[PDB]
């Protein structure tokens, strides 16, 4: 069973695109391959949300129990981190967590790099472009969510500290004198790192998928599959809690 | 403040070369290393006779200083071993004093600048003051005399057991015998390389960074290099005593 690639070759890794590709042309903004997946994740989230909240049973059960458990676990983590800002940032943090989690889980579906439209289709004149590209596999999505988080945390820091946060200290004129610009650039550059890692983890996961399918698509890729299914979940949660902790250190 | 402003004194001079010799008009031309060694011999003999010309209890002045340093060395050696604390004591004491005064001598004013001619001309201008420790011939000599002393005292009382740590047949002990034997065999080469390169590096440092800045810069660096000169002067005696202790054991 080791040499199944000789009988069935997966073909060369024809996917290498590191940017969003317009899957469908539109009169306005063309429909990119990642934005449609983002909308799919959005509607799936809305569907499960209304399904768990259609009855709103007092006693949690089934899917309602699952979502209640997840939400209370996250809420407990947040109250452990910060006290007076749990509900303030809870919605945005939880949304950006679960959305990218479901995007990562969607990234492993069959045909996410194989099924697609033509500009099997390589034989056709139109170039075989893939469908089901993750939103995190779009840099623009990562940039947007990172800057949204950054503007949220700086707005709330300004609300908390007034002109104190507005100047973020940096008035020591002593040991912390040259430091004020150091944390200034540090919090300037961190959301870039967040967006970059959001892109990179998913991009690496999918290229790993492609390369391990190319080498041996039988009994080899499975531990790696476990690797990305674990890393997507843990990375999504650490992004969420990192945003929360960034807010908690911005207020303080 | 106290700026340098010594652009006039910043002449281009970064010359350095381990090779060095005196006029050597007679046979075996002598080197500037082996006139500094001789002057160190003269100075240590003068200090020894000055401390010896008045020997009495409750030492004072120079006598107190020499007694203090001698007892300090004796105690430091006794901290390692006491059976051979006096067997090699004159040897290590003489070596330490010689290298101490030799490394001191390379730091005096005009050291490295007293050209023997043979400036402002095409003459060689060989510096008369060159530290014998910073010269390989003396350094190799002290290394090899330390070596001959250590195996002399090893085979003095070890029978054939001196060559028992090596060329054994115990297996792993026989395996490590070769490498340990090579280690002690090459130890004197290490002694020479240390005790040459340390002083040579110190004096070339002084030369180059005085060439960069003439005034007010090298003083902490002067302190650093005199301290390290002290360090190698003392460690040589320390390591020789430790090596002979591990050899006799």
């Amino acid at each position: 069973s080791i040499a199944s690639r000789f009988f069935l070759y997966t073909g060369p890794p024809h996917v290498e695109v590191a940017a969003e590709v317009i899957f469908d042309g539109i009169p306005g903004f063309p429909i990119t391959n990642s934005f449609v997946v983002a909308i799919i994740i959005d509607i799936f989230v809305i569907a499960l949300a209304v399904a768990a909240t259609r009855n709103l049973q007092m006693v949690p059960r089934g899917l309602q129990n699952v979502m209640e458990f997840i939400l209370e676990s996250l809420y407990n983590l947040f109250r452990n981190i910060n006290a007076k800002y749990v509900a303030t940032a809870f919605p945005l943090v939880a949304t950006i967590f679960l959305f990218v989690l479901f995007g990562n889980w969607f990234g492993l579906l069959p045909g996410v790099g194989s099924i697609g439209v033509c500009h099997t289709c390589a034989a056709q004149g139109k170039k075989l472009v893939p469908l089901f590209r993750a939103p995190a596999a779009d840099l623009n999505f990562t940039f947007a969510i990172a800057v949204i988080s950054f503007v949220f945390i700086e707005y709330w820091g300004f609300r908390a500290l007034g002109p104190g946060y507005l100047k973020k200290f940096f008035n020591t004129n002593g040991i912390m004198s040259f430091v004020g610009i150091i944390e200034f650039i540090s919090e300037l550059v961190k959301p870039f790192a967040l967006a970059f890692r959001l892109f990179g983890n998913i991009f690496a996961g999918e290229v790993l998928l492609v390369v391990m399918a190319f080498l041996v698509p039988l009994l080899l890729p499975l531990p790696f599959y476990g690797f990305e299914v674990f890393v997507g979940f843990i990375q999504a949660l650490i992004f969420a809690l990192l945003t929360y902790a960034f807010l908690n250190i911005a207020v303080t | 403040i106290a700026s340098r402003f010594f652009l006039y004194t910043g002449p281009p001079h970064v010359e350095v070369a381990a090779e060095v010799i005196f006029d050597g008009i007679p046979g075996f031309p002598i080197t500037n290393s082996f006139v500094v060694a001789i002057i160190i011999d003269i100075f240590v003999i003068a200090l020894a006779v000055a401390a010896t010309r008045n020997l009495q209890m409750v030492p004072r002045g120079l006598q107190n200083v020499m007694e203090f340093i001698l007892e300090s060395l004796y105690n430091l050696f006794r901290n390692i071993n006491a059976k051979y604390v006096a067997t090699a004591f004159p040897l290590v004491a003489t070596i330490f004093l010689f290298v101490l005064f030799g490394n001191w001598f390379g730091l005096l004013p005009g050291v490295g600048s007293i050209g023997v001619c043979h400036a402002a001309q095409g003459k060689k201008l060989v510096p008369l003051f060159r530290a014998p420790a910073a010269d390989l011939n003396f350094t190799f000599a002290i290394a090899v005399i330390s070596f001959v002393f250590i195996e002399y005292w090893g085979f003095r009382a070890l029978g054939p057991g001196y060559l028992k740590k090596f060329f054994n047949t115990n297996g792993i002990m026989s395996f490590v015998g070769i490498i340990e034997f090579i280690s002690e065999l090459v130890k004197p080469f290490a002694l020479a390389f240390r005790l040459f390169g340390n002083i040579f590096a110190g004096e070339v440092l002084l030369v180059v960074m005085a060439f960069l800045v003439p005034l007010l810069l090298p003083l902490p660096f002067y302190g650093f290099e005199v301290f390290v000169g002290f360090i190698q002067a003392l460690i040589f005696a320390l390591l020789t005593y430790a090596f002979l202790n591990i050899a006799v054991t």
Binding site: I81, A193, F196, R197, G200, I238, A245, I249 | -
Partner: protein
């Protein structure tokens, strides 16, 4: 010439050695802390999370510079 490929190779290699022992001792210190005491687990786990986030931030900094060089 392939020189850009060598650039990307060096960039990703040094970016990988960047946080390795870093995050290793992060979780090592965290596990010593939790073994000594699990009562303050939340406060310390938050800080180890932010530290490992910073390490991964630098690693992906190197990685995305490698990508920009490659394209």
């Amino acid at each position: 010439e392939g020189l850009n490929l060598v650039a990307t190779a060096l960039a990703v290699g040094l970016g990988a050695i960047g946080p390795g022992v870093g995050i290793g001792i992060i979780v090592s210190g965290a596990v010593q802390a939790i073994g000594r005491n699990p009562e303050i687990e939340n406060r310390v786990v938050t800080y180890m999370f932010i530290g490992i986030a910073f390490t991964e931030a630098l690693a992906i900094f190197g990685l995305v510079i490698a990508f920009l060089i490659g394209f």
